[PDB]
Design an enzyme around this catalytic site. Sequence first.
Site, PDB file in Angstrom:
ATOM      1  N   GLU A  11       0.775  -1.230   0.000  1.00  0.00           N
ATOM      2  CA  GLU A  11       0.000   0.000   0.000  1.00  0.00           C
ATOM      3  C   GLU A  11       0.804   1.275   0.000  1.00  0.00           C
ATOM      4  OE1 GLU A  11      -3.017  -0.023  -0.549  1.00  0.00           O
ATOM      5  OE2 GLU A  11      -3.732  -2.033  -0.010  1.00  0.00           O
ATOM      6  N   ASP A  20      -6.669   6.707  -5.159  1.00  0.00           N
ATOM      7  CA  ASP A  20      -6.120   5.382  -5.330  1.00  0.00           C
ATOM      8  C   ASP A  20      -6.058   4.912  -6.783  1.00  0.00           C
ATOM      9  OD1 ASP A  20      -8.598   4.244  -5.578  1.00  0.00           O
ATOM     10  OD2 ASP A  20      -8.380   2.875  -3.840  1.00  0.00           O
TER      11      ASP A  20
END
Length: 162
Positions: A11, A20
């Site tokens: 991540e 994202d």
Amino acid sequence: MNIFEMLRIDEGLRLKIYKDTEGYYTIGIGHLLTKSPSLNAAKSELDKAIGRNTNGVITKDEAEKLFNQDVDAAVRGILRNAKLKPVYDSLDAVRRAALINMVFQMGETGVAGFTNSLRMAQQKRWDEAAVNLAKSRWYNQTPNRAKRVITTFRTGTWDAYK
Ligand SMILES: [Cl-]
Ligand SMILES: [Cl-]
């Protein structure tokens, strides 16, 4: 290696609100704020999460607390899902981390949809499960990451992350 380091690798760590791989506002270590196209909505989500007027920037310590919570939530989500629990219970520690990574990324429901793969893994048919896992939007959208999780799942080692 462990779940925390593993997800931290997948991540990354960002201290300012960001979009994202799908266009959603996120922050810290993969903490989705909202699916809404709105930055304000996202700022509001952040303050509520953090407990203060952030102005869209958090501290490392703040990011780490959200991350702790999310991991914890991922595990408990698994242990409470009827399709998921039994699989999880049947796996060794490394493979269990692979399952937590997936739930962290796509949620209890998303993961509960890898039905076929799940059943194979339960049967410990590593290869066939791995192939089946690969036939997904998930793999097609984020291949390198998907590739690492699938290898971990298949092999039960951390090689993909070393
Ligand atoms: Cl939260
Ligand atoms: Cl990726």
